[model samples]
Every structure is written in C-alpha cells, then in structure tokens.
Target: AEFKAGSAKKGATLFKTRCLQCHTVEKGGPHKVGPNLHGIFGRHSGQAEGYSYTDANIKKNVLWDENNMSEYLTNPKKYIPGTKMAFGGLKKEKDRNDLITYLKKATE
Candidate 1:
C-alpha cells in the first residue's frame, strides 16, 4: 500500500530528533556526517547533486524503493560494506516503513 501523510509526518519527527545530527533534509542544507536526505527515496543510490558516493554504493544498481529500504535498514553494513552511513539503523520494520514514507513526501 502507498504511504500516508500522517505516518510520514511521524517519521519526519523521528528524523528531526534522531537523524538531524548527521543528515540534512533541507533543499540546500550542508552535508553532515551523512548526505542530505532531501530527495533520497526514488533517487539512484549514488547520484546526489554533488556529494561523492562510496565506490560500493556507486557500483550497486539499486533504487531506493520500499523493499530495498527494508533490507538496507535491517543491516546497513551488510547492505553496503564500503559506505559510511554509521547510524545503527532503525530496527523495527514499522520505523523503516515510516521513514521511507516521510522521505517520499519530502521530495514532493
């Protein structure tokens, strides 16, 4: 099912509280420890505006879909061995779902 705005808003709140320290979501926000998450959901894995992506991620042919995101959040290091996203990851499936919901709307 498609995600809803309320769930997405909840995810946005979670991101603001937990992720802002490392990730940015504003149009021109500076990159922190992680890349800005402005338009990440439908985006290509390693092709943001100007950020340099890791070799491993760049080589992967994954789009940021709900299915891919679930796997990615479940185990980030295993998903991309050479990347630098150090967040431990949201362990719950619900949180992963919610986060993606928020991300999809953020770019709209």
Candidate 2:
C-alpha cells in the first residue's frame, strides 16, 4: 500500500498545469496528444479505443493502479520502454500523491 492521500484541490491544479497538455480526464473527453484518461483505473494498459499506442504500451497487459502508475510516472521510458510519451515525470512524492488523488477523482 504505497498510496497516501493528498489534497485533491491542489492535485487538480497540479494536473492542470503539468499534465493537461496531453491528457484529458473528463468523461467522454476528447483525446489530445495523449488518449483521454476517463476511467483509467481498472482499465488494461494502453487499451484506449481509437488510439494508437506504441508496441511497448499495448503489450504490457497491466491494469492501472496506484503502484504501477507511480512506477510509470517516476520514469516513463523506464516503466514502459519505447513509450512515445515524452514527459520527464514527477520526482517528488508529495506531488505524485496530490496528482494521483486528483486523478482518482477526476478520471472517475
């Protein structure tokens, strides 16, 4: 259980500033540079419809959850090698907590 709850309000802001460029979390939201993240939890990795993911992402077969997300956010390339996502990642644990908390709420 690596999860630790943080402020969703701050997380909302954090996500807007840091991740909104490529991701959209609202239900039925349109895909930007990255796929819309609605209902990300419980979804199999890289299964977003109408989206073309790299071979590395589509074949992972992992469910989205706190632990794997943390690992992925720590280093996108390291987590899923050859992933096309270019984010550098959030190194601070506090920021990750806030962001994930927001995601858990916003992405439904």
Candidate 3:
C-alpha cells in the first residue's frame, strides 16, 4: 500500500475540522460519542479504556498502525463489518493520509 506524505499541521486542522466532533485526541481525554484516541496508533482495536466498543471491533483483533488506520479511516463500516462507528468515511485520500499522520503525532 502507498501512502502520501502527510502534513501534521494540516492534519491538525483537519482533525479539529471533523474528528473532534466525535473523538478526543489528548491523553486521558474523556471519551465522547466515540472512544478517546489518545495513544491509539499502536493500540489494539477496541481496547481503549472506559469505552464500549462494538462486537465487531472488539473481535477484530487488529492493531492500529499507519496502513491499518488508513484502511479503517477510509471506510469504517467497510473495514470492520458491523462496527458501531457511524462515520460515513473520509472520502479523500489526502484527508485520510493527513488524519492518520495527525493521529500518529497527536496520540504520541
């Protein structure tokens, strides 16, 4: 899989623009409608603390890495069938790449 080089600054803007409405990006941040994304990159799917992950996500047993994140972010529903995430998906390749980059940095 090929990933475009992403800009963290730009990715931050995009995160604020879209993800913040449903997710929290800071360490120990409160879980909102979705799970807190702090330290998410290396974590296993659906393993975040204090969140009720869907059966599909909990059973997937996938790690959240750059490639997996890109695939999942591009289409959450399609990535894990029956996932509870209601996001329609990030439509642009750049947005997915940028958001993935931003998440990697932000969750660090």
Give per-residue CA lDDT, model 1, range 1-108, as digits (tens): 233334887788877876789878888778877777777777788766777778988887578877787788777778888777657777777776777778677755
Structural similarity to truth (TM-score) of each candidate: 0.81, 0.94, 0.93
Q: How many Å off is the CA of 74 in candidate 1? A: 1.8
By summed lDDT, which 10 consecutive residues of candidate 2 come out lowest?
66-75
What does candidate 3 score on TM?
0.93
Error of 2 at 99 (Å): 0.3
RMSD of each: 2.7, 1.2, 1.2
Residue-level lDDT for 108 in candidate 2: 87
Per residue, candidate 3 scores C-alpha lDDT tens digits across 27-75 of 8999999989988877798888999988999999888888877888788
Comparison by TM-score, 2 against 3, better one: 2
**10 residues in a row with least lDDT, candidate 3:** 1-10
Q: Please report how far candidate 2 places residue 59 from its true position, in Å.
A: 1.1
Itemize residue pairs with steric clashes in candidate 1: none
* lDDT string, candidate 2, 1-108, tens digits: 266889899999989988999989988898899998999888998877777888898888779997788777878888888888768888888888889999998998
Score residue 31 of candidate 3 by CA lDDT. 91
Q: In what order do the candidates fall by lDDT, top score first?
A: 2, 3, 1
- lDDT for predicted candidate 1 compared with the true structure: 0.74
TM-score of 1: 0.81
Ranked by TM-score, the better of candidates 1 and 2 is 2
lDDT of each: 0.74, 0.85, 0.84
